[PDB]
Write a protein that binds this ligand. Structure first.
Ligand SMILES: CC(C)(COP(=O)(O)OP(=O)(O)OC[C@H]1O[C@@H](n2cnc3c(N)ncnc32)[C@H](O)[C@@H]1OP(=O)(O)O)[C@@H](O)C(=O)NCCC(=O)NCCSC(=O)c1ccc2ccccc2c1
Ligand SMILES: Cc1cc2nc3c(=O)[nH]c(=O)nc-3n(C[C@H](O)[C@H](O)[C@H](O)COP(=O)(O)OP(=O)(O)OC[C@H]3O[C@@H](n4cnc5c(N)ncnc54)[C@H](O)[C@@H]3O)c2cc1C
Ligand SMILES: Cc1cc2nc3c(=O)[nH]c(=O)nc-3n(C[C@H](O)[C@H](O)[C@H](O)COP(=O)(O)O)c2cc1C
Ligand code: SF4
Length: 660
């Protein structure tokens, strides 16, 4: 099947079994106190190695405390980090994967002070905990604090720290070393004309701006030797107004190959300060491949690998075939499904847990100093915890799952994988629950890949799927199961709003279910995630939409990465919104509201959508007590409304606990 993706390839002197690479992923799994590698991180990458990835890269390791940009970033500074580095390398090498250590000083994005650093040594002198860069300056956004200009001594020092960091990797069994010179970290800071305002040998012309990177490459090449694999990550476009152009990054790449032999180029897209889209669902697989074509036609000697929304094996396969790239790199797809490679080379892509790009468990959690997690993969960060082990339990109990939503299908999938006699009751004609409806939203198209997954596991696990069957207090008893899993989900709320009983009112479910004939002027009462996403679907059809939020901001329950995603879309669709508005009435023509200080104002509309919240659809659960079956359980939104992430987690936490 996926012949090209499974082809071998030599990276330097080391042969790689396939063309699938798991990219560096800082996940705060390391000890936040000192940057040492711990079991959580060891078992995390071990599973990615077991999964079949021909290459597994560690997270970006910080070469200096001032370069720590994540509360739990791996450290590459002192000898106290060697035991963990050797253990992690062996875990990856044992699985037949090429282990590669990444060296990453965050530079301008450092948060040493936020992590409790009062003072540090740099260039033989005491300094403050502020981040460092080639030029002292402030960030346009508040996340990154003002940086300090690096003395020429600190620059020479960091060249050595990279050399030493490469040594720590090689001497601990790592099969290769990767230099991280992307998205806005220290090296990228010197390469960019926007952040590098220096006039000495380290700044000015494109040659001087790239001197820092070249000296890091030359220094490491001498340290590791001509045989050791040396690769790097370099932007192909930084998406920064005033930064470097696409052809400049190509020229920089040429300079790197002229200085040392580059074994592999990982070309990236954008900076954390870029106002454009680089990794959100807005971008589809294959959109950035045109940048790879530029590097290939320009004569780049080393092979190239790319990622950034390349969550489709089909697209990657065609890419490797056409020579656009030489390796299919990926980070989020490797998080969502550690066994994606094994599933690809075994001709079973239908079993892939695809990445939806929710950016909640991975990007968002890591930037808020939290343990990384995954929406579709509840094992991320728990690969070490025996509580998530999947045990057989030869008893084989009879399990009845009520609700084919995400939580219900995750509970049944595992219970079936463990040998239980699972059955699912669905009152509708299709599985998916609210995911079946959200997939209609423009930015959630990936949710179709999720439906496919569960639809394929049910068909492969021989699970009893009873579609068009509304579970009642009688059918359950008739089925007489050993364990009852109630996953009815949630339903739209209906607050006490004068006139809410008017015909002009409708809820989210009816909209996405086509059980309503809307018009051209629509108004949504509620600025939460679900409400906004529903409006996007309404506007996509060519209709005027307005969102009314009583709170201070819209998209209040949206992660910081997706906030920028809705703005670009709500604006592209010409959508209006209002905050701090009081809902006073809903009549035939629309909804009457009031701002701060009276200011009564009507909103003429053809359809008013009450989408302020969701209610737990716990009707059935409360009708059948905990005595109807030897073991009764409620999971998902019916046991308390949460989001999709907490639903799949509840399902898997339930599928592995069904002992009897
Ligand atoms: C999520 C942010 C990183 C910042 O978060 P935050 O909202 O908390 O920043 P801040 O609070 O300081 O910003 C305040 C205001 O500016 C807005 N803002 C923040 N970042 C913005 C931005 N980039 N453009 C426009 N507005 C922005 C933000 O919406 C907010 O609006 P307001 O308070 O309501 O008035 C944001 O900049 C952002 O979404 N960046 C996009 C990330 C991105 O695409 N990076 C390039 C591709 S990712 C990549 O290749 C990569 C490589 C290596 C990595 C290693 C470690 C971890 C991840 C890595 C990713
Ligand atoms: C439009 C929309 C967009 C959303 N976007 C996001 C998002 O971006 N991020 C996020 O985290 N969350 C999002 N959510 C929320 C997320 O979809 C839910 O949290 C999640 O689907 C809850 O899963 P569940 O299995 O607990 O319930 P559900 O998904 O609602 O599953 C319930 C299923 O059980 C069936 N059922 C109910 N009662 C019975 C019965 N008596 N007998 C048989 N079958 C029954 C229902 O028909 C349904 O198929 C969105 C929701 C909507 C509606
Ligand atoms: C949580 C998280 C941590 C990341 N850590 C690193 C890192 O340490 N070094 C690096 O070069 N890229 C890092 N990245 C960027 C990814 O390696 C990858 O290039 C990017 O997320 C887009 O690729 P993808 O679409 O396959 O996810 C990280 C991304 C995420 C979401
Ligand atoms: S949390 Fe979302 S974006 Fe991150 S890996 Fe999982 S599915 Fe992909």
């Amino acid at each position: 099947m996926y012949e090209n993706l499974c082809k071998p390839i030599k990276i330097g002197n080391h042969l790689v079994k396939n063309r699938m690479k798991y990219a560096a992923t800082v996940d705060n799994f390391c000890d936040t106190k000192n940057g040492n590698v711990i079991d959580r991180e060891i078992e995390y990458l071990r599973e990615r190695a077991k999964g079949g990835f021909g290459i597994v890269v560690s997270q970006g390791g910080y070469t200096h405390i001032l370069g720590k940009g994540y509360v739990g970033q791996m450290g590459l500074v002192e000898e106290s980090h060697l035991p963990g580095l050797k253990k992690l390398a062996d875990a990856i090498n044992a699985e037949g994967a090429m282990s590669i250590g990444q060296i990453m000083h965050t530079g301008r994005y450092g948060h040493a002070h936020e992590y409790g650093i009062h003072e540090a040594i740099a260039g033989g002198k005491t300094v403050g905990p502020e981040p460092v860069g080639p030029t002292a300056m402030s960030s346009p956004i508040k996340r990154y604090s003002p940086c300090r200009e690096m003395t020429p001594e600190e620059i020479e020092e960091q060249i050595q720290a990279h050399i030493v960091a490469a040594r720590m990797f090689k001497q601990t069994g790592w099969k290769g070393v990767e230099v991280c010179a992307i998205v806005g970290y220290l090296i990228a800071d010197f390469l960019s004309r926007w952040t590098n305002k220096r006039t000495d040998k380290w700044g000015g012309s494109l040659e001087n701006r790239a001197r820092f990177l070249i000296e890091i490459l030359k220094g490491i090449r001498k340290e590791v030797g001509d045989d050791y694999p040396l690769v790097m990550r370099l932007n192909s476009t930084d998406l920064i107004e005033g930064g470097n152009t696409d052809e400049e990054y190509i020229e920089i790449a040429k300079m790197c190959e002229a200085a040392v032999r580059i074994d592999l180029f990982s070309i990236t897209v954008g900076w954390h300060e870029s106002p454009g889209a680089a990794i959100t669902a807005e971008k589809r697989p294959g959109d950035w491949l045109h940048l790879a074509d530029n590097w290939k036609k320009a004569g780049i000697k080393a092979p190239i690998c790319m990622a950034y929304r390349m969550n489709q094996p089909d697209v990657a396969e065609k890419a490797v075939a056409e020579g656009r790239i030489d390796i299919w790199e990926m980070c989020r797809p490797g998080i969502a499904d550690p066994y994606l490679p094994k599933k690809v080379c075994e001709g079973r892509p239908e079993d892939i847990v695809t990445c939806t790009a929710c950016n909640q468990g991975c990007f968002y959690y890591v930037f808020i100093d939290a343990i990384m997690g995954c929406m579709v993969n509840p094992r991320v960060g728990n690969e070490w915890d025996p509580a998530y082990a999947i045990n057989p339990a030869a008893k084989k109990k009879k399990v009845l799952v009520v609700g084919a939503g995400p939580s219900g299908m995750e509970c049944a999938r595992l219970a079936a994988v463990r040998g239980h006699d699972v059955t699912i009751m669905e009152k509708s004609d299709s599985i998916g629950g609210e995911v079946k409806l959200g997939v209609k939203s423009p930015l959630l198209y990936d949710w179709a890949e999720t439906i496919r997954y569960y639809k394929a596991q049910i068909d492969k696990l021989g699970i009893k799927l009873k579609l068009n069957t509304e579970a009642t207090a009688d059918s359950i008893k008739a089925e007489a199961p050993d364990v009852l899993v109630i996953a009815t989900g949630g339903k739209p709320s209906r607050p006490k709003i004068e006139g809410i009983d008017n015909k002009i009112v409708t809820n989210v479910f009816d909209i996405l279910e086509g059980k309503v004939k809307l018009g051209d002027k629509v108004v949504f009462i509620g600025g939460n995630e679900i409400s906004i996403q529903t409006a996007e679907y309404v506007a996509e059809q060519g209709k005027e939409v307005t969102v009314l939020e009583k709170g201070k901001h819209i998209c209040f329950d949206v992660n910081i990465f997706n906030i920028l995603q809705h703005r670009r879309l709500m604006a592209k669709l010409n959508m209006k919104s209002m905050t701090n508005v009081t809902i006073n009435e809903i009549n035939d023509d629309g909804v009457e509201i009031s701002t701060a200080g009276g200011k009564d104002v009507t909103i003429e509309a053809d359809n008013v959508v009450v989408a302020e919240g969701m209610d737990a659809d716990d009707a059935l659960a409360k009708a059948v007590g905990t005595k109807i079956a030897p073991e009764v359980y409620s999971i998902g939104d019916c046991a308390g409304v949460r989001k999709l992430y907490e639903a799949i987690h509840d399902g898997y936490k339930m599928g592995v606990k069904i002992r009897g």
